Amino acid sequence: KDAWEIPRESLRLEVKLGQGCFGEVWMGTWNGTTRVAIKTLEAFLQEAQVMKKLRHEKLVQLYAVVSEPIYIVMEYMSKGCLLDFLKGEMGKYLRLPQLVDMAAQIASGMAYVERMNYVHRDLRAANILVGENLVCKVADFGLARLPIKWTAPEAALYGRFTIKSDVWSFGILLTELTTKGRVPYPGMVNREVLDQVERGYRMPCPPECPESLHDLMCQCWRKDPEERPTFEYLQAFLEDYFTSTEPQYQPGENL
């Protein structure tokens, strides 16, 4: 029992948050003082194992872990899921500068993962958590080492997960951001996407999305994993976007 392990008695589970399909997600308090977010249910726990080796400000942080009834105490993200955020009420008001900045922060969390020689493998809006001040953090490392509409073709087909398949997924994440959370490849079933993506099909520029940002998406979707940008490049590109790339940006109806 390593030094991440706590007494369950130190926890006060409080509010179901909290969907809810692989076990549960609760709000809580830890050691009476700390506002945390628990996570109920054996190796599951794989997520906790990897979040022991990772620590970055744009990755939701492991606090503590348990046995069942196995809990994973973690940083509390007050705004929940990004997917919900984007399609909920606080979604119609988000424009390009907010959304690009959200992109920037996810790229920063993913740039760290990249430095650390990890692969996330399940990178998408559902797996980004939002807090106050529009802070976005990469969550749900359950599948991380050392769904196909977000999965690079080579990884979906031959199980070839690399940082570069995360990049692909990032490109699809960018479309979720730019469309307020719409499912990628509108009106396409899983099999039609695989076959079409194999044939060279890529999603078009979202309405109101500048061509410079869709090009970035297309870079992330290059057939050739190794020809896709790094996260360090995407972080920097997104951070500087409004000066270096679209300094003539004017708001529109939706972006």
Query: Residue 39 belongs to what domain range?
Result: 1-76
Taking residue 245's Cβ as centre, other Cβ atoms within 10 Å add up to 17
**Same domain assignment for residues 24 and 123:** no
Report resolution (Å) to 1 decimal.
2.3
Q: What is the CA radius of gyration of the chain?
A: 19
What CATH number is given to the structural domain containing 63? 3.30.200.20
**Same domain assignment for residues 96 and 71:** no
C-alpha distance from residue 167 to each of 9, 100, 106, 124, 185 (Å): 41, 16, 11, 11, 17
Q: Report residue 202: phi and psi, to 5°.
A: -135, 145
- For residue 40, being part of any structural domain is answered with yes
**Same domain assignment for residues 176 and 104:** yes
Rounded-to-integer distance, Cα 201 and Cα 24, Å = 37
Q: Active-site residues: which are they?
A: 122
Residue 253 labeled ligand binder: no
Q: Quote the DSSP letter at residue 205.
A: P
- For residue 254, being part of any structural domain is answered with no
**Same domain assignment for residues 71 and 84:** no
> Helices in 67-162 by DSSP H: which ranges?
82-87, 96-115, 153-158
- For residue 133, being part of any structural domain is answered with yes
Rounded-to-integer distance, Cα 46 and Cα 120, Å = 12
Rounded-to-integer distance, Cα 165 and Cα 36, Å = 31
Give the Cα-Cα-Cα angle 165, 56, 234 (nearest 5 degrees): 45
Domain boundary among 48, 76, 104: 76
Residue 238 labeled ligand binder: no
Rounded-to-integer distance, Cα 208 and Cα 218, Å = 16
**Same domain assignment for residues 44 and 89:** no
Residue 19 labeled ligand binder: yes
| Cβ atoms 128, 139 nearer than 8 A | yes
- For residue 205, being part of any structural domain is answered with yes
Structure-determination approach: X-ray
What CATH number is given to the structural domain containing 211? 1.10.510.10
Q: What spatial distance separates the first Cα and last Cα of the chain, rounded to whole Å?
A: 50
